[PDB]
Amino acid sequence: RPPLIERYRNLLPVSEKTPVISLLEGSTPLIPLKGPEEARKKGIRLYAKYEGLNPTGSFKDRGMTLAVSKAVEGGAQAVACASTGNTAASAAAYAARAGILAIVVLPAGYVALGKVAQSLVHGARIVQVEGNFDDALRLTQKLTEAFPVALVNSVNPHRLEGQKTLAFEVVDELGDAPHYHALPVGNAGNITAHWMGYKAYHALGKAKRLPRMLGFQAAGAAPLVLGRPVERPETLATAIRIGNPASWQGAVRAKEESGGVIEAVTDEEILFAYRYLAREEGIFCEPASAAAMAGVFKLLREGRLEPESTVVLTLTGHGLKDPATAERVAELPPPVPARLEAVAAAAGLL
Amino acid sequence: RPPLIERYRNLLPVSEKTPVISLLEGSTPLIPLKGPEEARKKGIRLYAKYEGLNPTGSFKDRGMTLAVSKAVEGGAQAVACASTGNTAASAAAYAARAGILAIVVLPAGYALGKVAQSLVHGARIVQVEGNFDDALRLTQKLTEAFPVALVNSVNPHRLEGQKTLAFEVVDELGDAPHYHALPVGNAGNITAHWMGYKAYHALGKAKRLPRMLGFQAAGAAPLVLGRPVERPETLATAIRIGNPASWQGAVRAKEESGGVIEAVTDEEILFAYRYLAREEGIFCEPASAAAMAGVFKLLREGRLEPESTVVLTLTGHGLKDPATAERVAELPPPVPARLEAVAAAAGL
After folding, report:
1. Is B128 helix (H, G, I), strand (E, B) or coil?
2. Which residue of A has its CA nearest to B95?
3. B236 and which of A253, A311, B244, B287 could share a cystine (Cβ 3.0–4.6 Å)?
4. Contacts of residue B95 in chain A, CB cutoff 8 Å?
């Protein structure tokens, strides 16, 4: 578990002067999946790159380590972002590591304490402003122009470069790029970065082939599938509940250049893949992450994945990031007498 | 990349017959801490073995992979435990990967958050109309009568699997640290840590044995008081134990290593919890922070030799305890929507 920036120093926009702000992110597990059965029948092998095991529980740590390191190199006294979710938590953790501030401007009364609790524990400066979400993104931009504050949003070039390393790790472990690489698509910075990584490694010669990128969006927030902005995005998969992806062009180019696709999966399909991963593979990831698996299930049922191929899935966040979705009223059986046979019966051992 | 059981195959009770049930646990980050100042002031270097980055969010995955693999080797149809939280979640995840049942036995008591993670993996919760002892006793008899493996803190394979943490620390540092601090609940972890250092010592990998520094919450410090605590109290749930199952193993580790087992207050725990998050960028479970609180204690008492290396095992991820995170978090009141007060509110 080396610092990501050091592991791929020669391939990243860093110099000897770059302060390495690392929490030893990256180098996450690439878990060979048992199935599904639909895949093994065709000799198709799936591997899950478990990004939920990064320092803050999100793949964004890959980009944040580089973005914060570069921000500090440029004399930044703080970093800022528009998100109230994983980006903010990652920014806050790396800011804490760097000894600088993490600023998040949000419309007053919008977020819940629980959603930003992680970032706050890291000491994030959450600034609720008496204005529209419009004013938030705006005041943030201006803050970056009037003060030594770096914007660490999805389009930050350093976040994209840092995120590209996931592809590097996959190739290092498998020996070549996979035939397919499935991942969730929200603001699309991740799919853009994945493709950047695969192309760079291909140019370097470490990867002989280029994978077909398979991006998946929740049906309720599928602008890249519909080919138009979605004004009212909705989905249980919060991490990809985006109607106007910031990296729209990057995603389309990744899709076209790789010979891949960007399609939609329903919330029911996402939930099914979510349960499948947890109950059959023992992998607990958040709903958005499960969208990638739902996408593979979709293409498998449609017979669109060639037999004997290798499919890698990027599970972007840990299941513990969204306990709400896992805390549906369980409706557990009534308790039983404190007797062994009663327990065994209830346990389903009889 | 080889699974934990494969990486240390020659040092574990496994053979070619053992089915490897792994989620690629282990190989967790050993983060070099920036400080604190008290340590830097004496050239003391701290490293945090971030076990919260294991598959289920806690170090227990280390023991669970071996315990479940061995259980299946023996044809176990399920694994069981009489606890909620981390052990339950880990057992459930590995049972799910192995394709067997995960049974969780609990008293008649009604919070879903305590077992939601085990449930998402498909664990079967069995509530009994009795107390903790009844559940524990019934769980033991269950594993003695039925083809179910007991995966509690004293399962021998859980201890052997957990010992690998020491192996990894030595592998990365190049030698064992002068000191190794960690939280102590049921004491299986400190017992396993010492076992690991002993095994690596036999191999010649560790050129010194660390002094083991175990820490308990003041409201639940039976190993500190020298006797059981009938009503253990502390916000650090993972170590709120009044009668540690591995009592003797903990005492031996303390004595043999020339270490200690002392208490830290809940206030000191929260202080260390906040420190790690705000100063080091590390978000761990409060119980895990007890290890840092322990180091802070010895540091202010001047009990750590200068120029020494100290490793801390941060047992669980901060995401395990959103309740405490929300309690510690503070959302500032809104301010007008103009650069002026935003810059001030941002601390610029």
Report:
1. strand
2. A282
3. B287
4. 282
* A136 among annotated binding-site residues: no
H helix intervals, chain A: 4-7, 37-40, 61-73, 86-98, 113-121, 133-146, 157-174, 189-204, 223-226, 248-258, 267-276, 287-301, 323-326, 340-347
- Token look-up 């620390």 returns B169
A199: part of which helix (H) or strand (E)? helix A189-204
CA dihedral of residues B118, B120, B121, B125 (deg, nearest 10) = 50
Please give the Cα distance from A263 to A215 (Å, whole number).
Answer: 6
Q: Please, what is the angle between helix A189-204 and helix A248-258, to 10°?
A: 40
Q: Which of A53, A94, A149 to mutate: most B Cβ within 10 Å?
A: A53
State whether the Cα torsion B235-B241-B246-B247 is positive or negative.
Answer: positive
The B124-129 sheet, strands edge to edge: A336-337, B124-129, B101-107, B78-81, B148-150
Chain A residues within 8 A of B141 when measuring between CB atoms: 340
Antiparallel, parallel or unpaired: β A30-32 and A45-50: antiparallel
List the structure tokens of B291: 């290890």
Smallest CA–CA distance, residue B288 to chain A, in Å, is 15
Tracing tokens 């002068």 back to the chain, one arrives at B178
Cβ distance A127 to B50 less than 8 Å, yes or no, reads: no
**Residue B269, Cα to own-chain centre: how many angstroms?**
15
Alpha helices in chain B (DSSP H): 4-7, 37-40, 60-73, 86-98, 116-120, 132-145, 156-162, 164-173, 188-203, 222-225, 247-257, 266-275, 286-300, 322-328, 339-345
Within chain A, how many helices (H) and strands (E) appear? 14, 11
C-alpha to C-alpha distance for B142 and B334, rounded to whole angstroms: 56
Residues of A in contact with B129 (CB under 8 A): 335-338
Q: Per the CB < 8 Å rule, is A319 touching B117?
A: yes
Min Cα separation A142/chain B (Å): 7
Domains of chain A in sequence order: 1-58+156-350 (3.40.50.1100), 59-155 (3.40.50.1100)
Are B100 and B171 spatial neighbours (Cβ–Cβ below 8 Å)? Answer: no
> DSSP character for B276?
I
Which chain A residue lies closest to B93 (C-alpha atoms)?
A: A282
What are the tokens at B99?
């394709």
Smallest Cβ–Cβ distance between B142 and the set A31, A96, A340 belongs to A340
Both tokens of B263, joined, read 């208490």
CA distances, B274 to each of A122, A124, B288, B327 (Å): 7, 12, 12, 12
At residue A184, φ and ψ (nearest 5 deg) are -75, 155
Q: How distant is the alpha carbon of residue B207 from its chain centre?
A: 25
Residue in A with minimal Cα distance to B122: A279
**At residue A305, what are phi and psi to the nearest 5 degrees?**
-115, 125
Entry resolution in angstroms? 1.9
Report whether A162 belongs to an annotated binding site: no
Q: Which amino acid is at B277?
A: A
> Taking CA B94 as the corner, what is the angle to CA B92 and CA B99, rounded to the nearest 5 degrees?
90
Q: Could you count the other beta carbons within 10 Å of the beta carbon of residue A117?
A: 23
On whether the CB atoms of residues B23 and A282 are closer than 8 A, the answer is: yes
Mutation site for A-interface testing, chosen from B7, B23, B61, B86 by largest number of A Cβ within 10 Å: B23
State which approach was used to obtain the coordinates.
X-ray
Contact B127 A335 (CB under 8 A): yes
Residue A187 assigned ligand-binding role: yes
Distance in angstroms (rounded) separating the CA atoms of residues B128 and B124: 13
Backbone dihedral region for residue A46 (phi beyond 0: left; psi -120 to 50: alpha; all else: beta): beta
CB contact under 8 A, A120 and B331: yes
Q: Helix, strand, or coil here: B109? A: coil
Calculate how close chain B gets to A76, using CA atoms only, in Å: 11
Amino acid identity of A275? R
Pairwise CB contact (< 8 Å): B325 & A50: no
